[PDB]
A paper describes a structure:
Physiologically, β2m is degraded in the kidneys; DRA patients typically suffer from kidney dysfunction that results in β2m accumulation in the serum following dialysis. Following our previous approach, in the present study we engineered a β2m homodimer where the DD strand interface is specifically locked by a disulphide bond (linking the engineered C33 residues of two β2m molecules – DimC33). Therefore, the unprompted dimerization of S33C implies that in solution, under native conditions, the DD association interface spontaneously brings together two monomeric β2m molecules, and only once the DD interface is properly assembled, the two facing Cys33 establish the disulphide bond, which results in the formation of the covalent dimeric species (DimC33). In summary, our study presents an engineered β2m covalent dimer, DimC33, displaying the same biophysical properties of wt β2m in solution, such dimer mimics the first oligomer formed during β2m aggregation.
The three crystal structures display three different space groups and crystal packings. The electron density is of excellent quality and all β2m molecules are completely traceable in all three structures. Overall, no major structural effects on the β2m fold are induced by the S33C mutation, either locally or globally, in all DimC33 structures. The monomeric components of DimC33 most closely match the conformation of wt β2m as observed in its physiologic class I major histocompatibility complex. The only noticeable difference occurs in the DE loop (residues 57–60) that displays a slightly modified conformation so that Trp60 participates in stacking interactions with Phe56, of the same chain, and with His51 and Tyr66 of the second chain within DimC33; the rotation of Tyr63 side chain of about 90 degrees is also observed. The covalent DD strand interface is structurally well conserved in all three DimC33 structures, where it maintains the same contact surface of 560 Å2. The superposition of DimC33 with previously reported β2m dimers, non-covalently associated through the DD strand interface, shows a very similar overall monomer-monomer orientation and conserved conformations for the residues involved. All such data indicate that the S33C mutation minimally affects the β2m fold, and that the C33 – 33C disulphide covalently locks the DD strand interface with negligible structural effects Fig. 1b–d.
Numbering used by the authors:
A (entry chain A), B (entry chain A): 0 to 98
């Protein structure tokens, strides 16, 4: 019933190797309420065709959600996850750290 | 982004036969926002140990959720689903109709 911020984790399925296909993930967890906005960013631009899990919840009413997309890294491409939620004073951008 | 009421469907896996195990379902669908309260009722009392699906959503941001429980009907037991949601002026109780 009380608001709780999301934990935000941005990570790839494998370590970044340029020119090899991979999956980019944004896992948002432990939040309340369920209303949340999650985008994956490529060089600061929203990625349009992104996949997501369902929104799961535990008996303490905390929520869990994953956004992800197949992608091929190149050295100069930068990726991030942008989250907005009522508990956040500003939308949060968390960068993908390749290593 | 606009609020939309849930559709509420209450149904059993098989037609009610007293003394035989069954599953009771409350499927709540097409709603927005995601914040929702769903209870299964036995003779007007909340059933405590109930199972649920995850909350799924389509690209139009409508949500879908199922609550369910294994149960054994007897002739006099009455079952229902109680839903509360911001779009509802009162909590809604939808009865299970055995046939």
């Amino acid at each position: 019933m009380i608001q709780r911020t999301p934990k935000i984790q941005v990570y790839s399925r494998h370590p970044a190797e340029n020119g090899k296909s991979n999956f980019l993930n944004c896992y948002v967890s432990g939040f309340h309420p369920c209303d949340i906005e999650v985008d994956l960013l490529k060089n600061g631009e929203r990625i349009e065709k992104v996949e997501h899990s369902d929104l799961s919840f535990s008996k303490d009413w905390s929520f869990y959600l994953l956004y992800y997309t197949e992608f091929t890294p190149t050295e100069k491409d930068e990726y991030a996850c942008r989250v907005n939620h009522v508990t956040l004073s500003q939308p949060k951008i968390v960068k993908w750290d390749r290593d």
